[PDB]
Ligand binder design. Sequence first.
Ligand SMILES: C[C@@H]1C[C@H]2[C@@H]3CCC4=CC(=O)C=C[C@]4(C)[C@@]3(F)[C@@H](O)C[C@]2(C)[C@@]1(O)C(=O)CO
Ligand SMILES: C[As](C)(=O)[O-]
Lengths: 14, 248
Amino acid sequence: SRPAILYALLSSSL
Amino acid sequence: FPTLISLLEVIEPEVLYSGYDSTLPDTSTRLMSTLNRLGGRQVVSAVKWAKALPGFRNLHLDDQMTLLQYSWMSLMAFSLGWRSYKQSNGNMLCFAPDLVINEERMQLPYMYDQCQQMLKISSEFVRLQVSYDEYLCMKVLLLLSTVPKDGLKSQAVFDEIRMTYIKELGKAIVKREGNSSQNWQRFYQLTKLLDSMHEMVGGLLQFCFYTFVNKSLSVEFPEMLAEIISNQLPKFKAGSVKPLLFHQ
Ligand SMILES: C[C@@H]1C[C@H]2[C@@H]3CCC4=CC(=O)C=C[C@]4(C)[C@@]3(F)[C@@H](O)C[C@]2(C)[C@@]1(O)C(=O)CO
Ligand SMILES: C[As](C)(=O)[O-]
């Protein structure tokens, strides 16, 4: 599915 | 108020060290694994770079994800080209200051073909004598040069960004030379280069997918890249990806 770390970095959302 | 070119200069990521251990002998698997581990970190650097890129944060989050997934290899290969051009005039691949692959090291099994590919990019910079500012702008364009076949969630904003950076490449060319009509000849050459990048990178992308999928080669990938590659892999097999060309 969707690439986790890249997503975490781009949203920054707690 | 700071110029856009000067922002591009300040936000450019600093060259990473690989921390390769030159004590142990080189093997194909080890080298490729090291390069991938380095790539992982370089990509994280590129993401942080994108988030500070003027314009970029206005895109929809999903468009951000898309452009970075579609173009990470271009960004990395292009930077490699630049470093190789700057440090060795295109003679060696300068992955990191502590990891330089020269003529001799390329003779390893599997290495020769892939290295020949990456050197092509380098010699392009050599041929065209690209300047730093030209490079910085072209690099941004690469981020914005591959889109899904049925467009983006915020095509509005995308097209504006793309246009700003094209204009910027313009200023960079002018700054090298003045307002001659050789200026548009240069613009052609540099846009021709940007175009030829889809083919060159496509080559690298193929080796990457091959070494990722074919477990018997024992090449390792860090989680960052693995997640991205495995998501991006079906999308490329299904040819659902569209290059934006400047030419015919
Ligand atoms: C030929 C391909 C293209 C290679 C990439 C070329 C671009 C790049 C620039 C770097 O400064 C370091 C890592 C990367 C991002 C890379 F060098 C490695 O990841 C290994 C890589 C995918 C490859 O060598 C392999 O698939 C071997 O695993
Ligand atoms: C914060 As950096 C210079 O690793 O992109």
